[PDB]
Curated annotation (Swiss-Prot), chain A:
The gene is rplF. Belongs to the universal ribosomal protein uL6 family. This is Large ribosomal subunit protein uL6. Signal peptide: none annotated. Keywords: Acetylation, Antibiotic resistance, Ribonucleoprotein, Ribosomal protein, RNA-binding, rRNA-binding. It comes from Escherichia coli (strain K12). One of its GO terms (cellular component) is cytoplasm. Part of the 50S ribosomal subunit. InterPro entries: Ribosomal_uL6-like (IPR000702), Ribosomal_uL6-like_a/b-dom_sf (IPR036789), Ribosomal_uL6_a/b-dom (IPR020040), Ribosomal_uL6_bac-type (IPR019906), Ribosomal_uL6_CS (IPR002358). Pfam families: Ribosomal_L6.
From Swiss-Prot, chain B:
One of its GO terms (molecular function) is large ribosomal subunit rRNA binding. The lineage of its organism: Bacteria, Pseudomonadati, Pseudomonadota, Gammaproteobacteria, Enterobacterales. Belongs to the bacterial ribosomal protein bL20 family. The gene is rplT. Part of the 50S ribosomal subunit. Contacts L21. GO terms for biological process: cytoplasmic translation; ribosomal large subunit assembly. Keywords: Ribonucleoprotein, Ribosomal protein, RNA-binding, rRNA-binding. This is Large ribosomal subunit protein bL20. One of its GO terms (cellular component) is cytosol.
UniProtKB/Swiss-Prot annotation, chain C:
It comes from the Bacteria. InterPro entries: Ribosomal_uL3, Ribosomal_uL3_bac/org-type, Ribosomal_uL3_CS, Transl_B-barrel_sf. HAMAP family: Ribosomal_uL3_B (MF_01325_B). Belongs to the universal ribosomal protein uL3 family. The modification N5-methylglutamine is found at residue 150. This is Large ribosomal subunit protein uL3. The modification N6-succinyllysine is found at residue 38. The lineage of its organism: Bacteria, Pseudomonadati, Pseudomonadota, Gammaproteobacteria, Enterobacterales. One of its GO terms (biological process) is cytoplasmic translation. GO terms for cellular component: cytoplasm; cytosol; cytosolic large ribosomal subunit. GO terms for molecular function: rRNA binding; structural constituent of ribosome. The keyword rRNA-binding applies. Methylated by PrmB. One of two assembly initiator proteins, it binds directly near the 3'-end of the 23S rRNA, where it nucleates assembly of the 50S subunit.
Curated annotation (Swiss-Prot), chain D:
This protein is one of the early assembly proteins of the 50S ribosomal subunit, although it is not seen to bind rRNA by itself. It is important during the early stages of 50S assembly. It holds the Pfam family Ribosomal_L13. Belongs to the universal ribosomal protein uL13 family. This is Large ribosomal subunit protein uL13. The gene is rplM. Part of the 50S ribosomal subunit. Keywords: Ribonucleoprotein, Ribosomal protein. GO terms for cellular component: cytoplasm; cytosol; cytosolic large ribosomal subunit; ribosome. It comes from Escherichia coli (strain K12). One of its GO terms (molecular function) is structural constituent of ribosome. GO terms for biological process: cytoplasmic translation; negative regulation of translation.
Length: 175, 59, 209, 142
RNA sequence: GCUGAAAGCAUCUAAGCACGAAACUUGCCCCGAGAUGAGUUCUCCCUGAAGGAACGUUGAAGAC
RNA sequence: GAUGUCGGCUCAUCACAUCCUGGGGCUGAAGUAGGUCCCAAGGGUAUGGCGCCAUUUAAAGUGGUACGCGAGCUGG
RNA sequence: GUGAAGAGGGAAACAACCCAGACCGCCAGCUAAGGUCCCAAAGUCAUGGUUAAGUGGGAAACGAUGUGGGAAGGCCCAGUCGGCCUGCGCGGAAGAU
C-alpha cells in the first residue's frame, strides 16, 4: 500500500504502449507484456503509470502493490540491468561456460545445460563467475540453474555458493 | 400433462405460468386447465388474447 | 521403413572361421512389386501396398484381375501393405529387391505361429500338478479352485483356463541378419523365426534401438 | 371431448446452431436438454419425441467456475477384473471435447428407448465449421 | 526454487514463471467398426450377371 | 421340514498401517554403515528339521474376502 | 402415539418417523407435511448480507496473521499495538470387488 502510492519516476528512452490490459515497454531492454489483473486500472500521465483499483474487485490495492512492486523491475532493470555473483570452494567439480552451453564434470557423465539470450557470463578468475542480464526473474532462474548442481554441503563448506551468503559449519560427531 | 401444456404456451408469450394463473384469478375467470390446454393447442388467437388480458389485470 | 515378404524354408547351421557354429534360418524371397501407393491428401496415411508370388488364371476373380491390371503387374499369392516412413517415395510397378537389407543388421520377424489345438491348462498357462498317490482320487490335472465363496459370486474376467492354443500372429524382435544372397534371392538370419515351413513371414527393421 | 395427442407422422422439426464460447456448462446443458425433449412447444406429449435438432460450435472454448478446472474428476470402469480409470477435466478437454458435452446432457434426459432417440438428435462439433449447411439452420441465442 | 505485495523489510503464492519419482497418460506386443457414431480407399456386375454355396482329393488347419 | 468343522495341495483377488527396489527432510548425518519421518501399491518376496534351529537371499511385509477355496483333492 | 387389525402423500429405497383415516364413479376446483434448474408437475422470482472451503454433502481434545460485524483501550504530525464477546470457514481425518 505504502509501496503502491509512491510515484516511481520512469525515465526516457522508453515507450508506454498500453494496448488494453497488456503493457508494452518496447525500449532499451525489450518488452514485457501480460494481461494485467482486470482490477488494477492503469493510466498514462507523466513519466509514471498511475495504478488504482477498479470497483467490484476483491484484492484491489493488494494487486496494485504487485503492479508497482514486481513491475518496479520494469522501471529499473531495463536501463540499469542486474548482475549476480557466484563462487565455489573445494576442488573436484568443473562447470565451464562454453557459449550458451554450460558443461559440467563432477566425478559422475558430464552434464549439459543452456544459457538464454540476454545473459552474459564472465569468469575474471577460475572460481568466481559474474552473470549479467536484463530481467530479475530470468537471472534468478539461471542462478537456480547454476547453484543446484553442487549445492553447499555444510560440513567443510565445499560446493558452489553465493558471494554474500553465510553458511554455518559445525562439528563432526565427537562420539 | 395439462399444466406443462399451459406453461409452455404461456412462456411462448412472455409470462410464466404462476403469474398467468395469478392474473386469471385476480381478473375473475374460472376456466380450468383442460379447456385452457385444448385452446392453447388448437387456436393460438384466443390464447394470446387471454394472456394479454391476464397481463393487463396483473399489473 | 519398409520390409519384405518371404517364405520360411528350414533351419540350418553356419560355421564361422574360428570354429563357432551359428544356428540360422533361411527365408526365400521373390521380388516384391509395388501395386498401390497411398498418401495424405486422399486417405490420411502414407503407405505402400505390395504383392508377391504367382497365381493361376482360374483362381483369380474378375475385380482382382482388373485391380492388378491397372498397375500392369502380374498376379500374386497375397497382398500386404507397409507404412511408409515419411520421406521415401516409390513409384507404381517398381520391384523391391533384397539388396536393401545390407546395412540394417537388426530385424524383427512377424508371422503366424503353429497351432496345438484344444490344449489343456498345464500345457497352456504352466500350472502345477497335484500328488499322484497318498489318497488322491480323480484329480491329477484339473485347475482347482477358481475363486471365493458367497462374496464375489462371480469368476472375474480374464481368468486363466483351458482353450485354443496357438495359431496366433506373433513377432520376434532383435534378430541378427547374417547373410543376404541377392543372386539366388535368399536371406539367412540367426535365430528361430515363428511358424512352420511354407508360411509367409514379414521382415522389418527393428523399431527399437 | 378428449385431450388430443400429438401424432408422430405429422410432427415438424427445425435446425438450430448454438455458439458456446465463454458459457458455463450447466446453464447451457439445461436449455439444450429442455429444447431436445420438446418442452418448449405447445404440442407436448411425454411419449412422442417433438424436439429440435441442435448443433453446438466451439466446444473446446467452454468454461467452468472455481477450481473445477482441475478438481473435477471423470471416472469409468472397464468392466474387467481390477481396473478403473480416472481423468481430470483438463486432460479430457484436451483429448476430446465432444464427450464432455455428450456426458452432461445424457444424464439430464430420461432413460430408455426414448432417451437414446432424443440423444440421437444432438450433434456437437469441436471447431467452428459444421457440415450441415444444406438444412439451413437458424442461429439461436442461449 | 525465481520475482513478488497484502504487512515500506522479510516470504515458494494471493497474480504470473522454472525443476522434480520403478508412480500417471504416451511409447513396446496383441485383439479391435454389433464403435447400431455400424467408418476409408481400388477394381468388378446388372439397360439369371459379378460372385457365393453344395460335391470331391486333402493339409505342418482341426472336438463337429 | 439341515448354513459341512481346523491344517496341507492347486488357484487367486484387493487395501496400504511399506520387507526389497525409486524420490527427499532432519540427525548427537567426516565416509562406510546407521535412526526416524514425508511421498510412492508398477514388479518380487526361500528350502529343510522337532514357538526354536541349520543355511541361502535385495527381501523372506501386515491384513479382510463364511479366520478365501471339500456340487476341486486330502480325512492327518 | 403408531404398527399388530390402515391404504394415500413426503423422508432416493425405508410395518413402528411428519401430514392425513379410502362406500362407488368423472379428462372439475381449493389446500396440509414437503417443494419450484433438468431427470420429475411448480420462481433460472423480489430486496439486504455471509461463505471460496465443493464448506453445504460425517466427528473430538487442541492449533493458526482466513474472513464479516461490535465494545473498550495505550502511543501518535499517519498510522500502529495486542487483549475480550460474536456469525461463517481451515488442519486434526488411513481399508480392504
Amino acid at each position: 500500500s505504502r509501496v503502491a502510492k509512491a510515484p516511481v519516476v520512469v525515465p526516457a528512452g522508453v515507450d508506454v504502449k498500453i494496448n488494453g490490459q497488456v503493457i508494452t515497454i518496447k525500449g532499451k531492454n525489450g518488452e514485457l507484456t501480460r494481461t494485467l489483473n482486470d482490477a488494477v486500472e492503469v493510466k498514462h500521465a507523466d513519466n509514471t503509470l498511475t495504478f488504482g483499483p477498479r470497483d467490484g474487485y476483491a484484492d484491489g490495492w493488494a494487486q496494485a502493490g504487485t503492479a508497482r512492486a514486481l513491475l518496479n523491475s520494469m522501471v529499473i532493470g531495463v536501463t540499469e540491468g542486474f548482475t549476480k555473483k557466484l563462487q565455489l570452494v573445494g576442488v573436484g567439480y568443473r562447470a565451464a561456460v562454453k557459449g550458451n552451453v554450460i558443461n559440467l564434470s563432477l566425478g559422475f557423465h558430464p552434464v549439459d545445460h543452456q544459457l538464454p539470450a540476454g545473459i552474459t557470463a564472465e569468469c575474471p578468475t577460475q572460481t568466481e563467475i559474474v552473470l549479467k542480464g536484463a530481467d530479475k526473474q530470468v537471472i534468478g532462474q539461471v542462478a537456480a540453474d547454476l547453484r543446484a548442481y553442487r549445492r553447499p554441503e555444510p560440513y567443510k563448506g565445499k560446493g558452489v555458493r553465493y558471494a554474500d551468503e553465510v553458511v554455518r559449519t559445525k562439528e563432526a560427531k565427537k562420539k | 400433462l395439462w399444466i406443462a401444456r399451459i406453461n409452455a404456451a404461456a412462456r411462448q408469450n412472455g409470462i410464466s405460468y404462476s403469474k398467468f394463473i395469478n392474473g386469471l384469478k385476480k381478473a375473475s375467470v374460472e376456466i380450468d386447465r383442460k379447456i385452457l390446454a385444448d385452446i392453447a393447442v388448437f387456436d393460438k388467437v384466443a390464447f394470446t388474447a387471454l394472456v394479454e388480458k391476464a397481463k393487463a389485470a396483473l399489473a | 521403413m519398409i520390409g519384405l515378404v518371404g517364405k520360411k524354408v528350414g533351419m540350418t547351421r553356419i560355421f564361422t572361421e574360428d570354429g563357432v557354429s551359428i544356428p540360422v534360418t533361411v527365408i526365400e524371397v521373390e521380388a516384391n512389386r509395388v501395386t498401390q501407393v497411398k498418401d495424405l491428401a486422399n486417405d490420411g496415411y502414407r503407405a505402400i501396398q505390395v504383392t508377391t508370388g504367382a497365381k493361376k488364371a482360374n483362381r483369380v476373380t474378375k475385380p482382382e484381375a482388373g485391380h492388378f491390371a491397372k498397375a500392369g503387374v502380374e498376379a500374386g499369392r497375397g497382398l500386404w501393405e507397409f507404412r511408409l516412413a515419411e520421406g521415401e517415395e516409390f513409384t507404381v510397378g517398381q520391384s523391391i529387391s533384397v539388396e536393401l537389407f545390407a546395412d540394417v543388421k537388426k530385424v524383427d520377424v512377424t508371422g503366424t505361429s503353429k497351432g496345438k489345438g484344444f490344449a489343456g491348462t498345464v500345457k497352456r498357462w504352466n500350472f502345477r500338478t497335484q500328488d499322484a498317490t497318498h489318497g488322491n482320487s480323480l484329480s491329477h490335472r484339473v485347475p482347482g479352485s477358481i475363486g471365493q465363496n458367497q462374496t464375489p459370486g462371480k469368476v472375474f474376467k480374464g481368468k486363466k483356463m483351458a482353450g485354443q492354443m496357438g495359431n496366433e500372429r506373433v513377432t520376434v524382435q532383435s534378430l541378427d541378419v547374417v547373410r543376404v544372397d541377392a543372386e539366388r534371392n535368399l536371406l539367412l538370419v540367426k535365430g528361430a523365426v515363428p511358424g512352420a515351413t511354407g508360411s509367409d513371414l514379414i521382415v522389418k527393421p527393428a523399431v527399437k534401438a | 371431448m378428449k385431450t388430443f395427442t400429438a401424432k408422430p407422422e405429422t410432427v415438424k422439426r427445425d435446425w438450430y446452431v448454438v455458439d458456446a464460447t465463454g458459457k458455463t456448462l450447466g446453464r447451457l446443458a439445461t436449455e439444450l436438454a429442455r429444447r431436445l425433449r420438446g418442452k418448449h412447444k405447445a404440442e407436448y406429449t411425454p411419449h412422442v419425441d417433438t424436439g429440435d435438432y441442435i448443433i453446438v460450435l466451439n466446444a473446446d472454448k467452454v468454461a467452468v467456475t472455481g477450481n473445477k478446472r482441475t478438481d473435477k474428476v471423470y471416472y469409468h470402469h472397464t468392466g474387467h477384473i481390477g481396473g478403473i480409470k480416472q481423468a481430470t477435466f483438463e486432460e479430457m478437454i484436451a483429448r476430446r471435447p465432444e464427450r464432455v458435452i455428450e456426458i452432461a446432457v445424457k444424464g439430464m434426459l430420461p432413460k430408455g428407448p426414448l432417451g437414446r432417440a432424443m440423444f440421437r438428435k444432438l450433434k456437437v462439433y469441436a471447431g467452428n465449421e459444421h457440415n450441415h449447411a444444406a438444412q439451413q439452420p437458424q442461429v439461436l441465442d442461449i
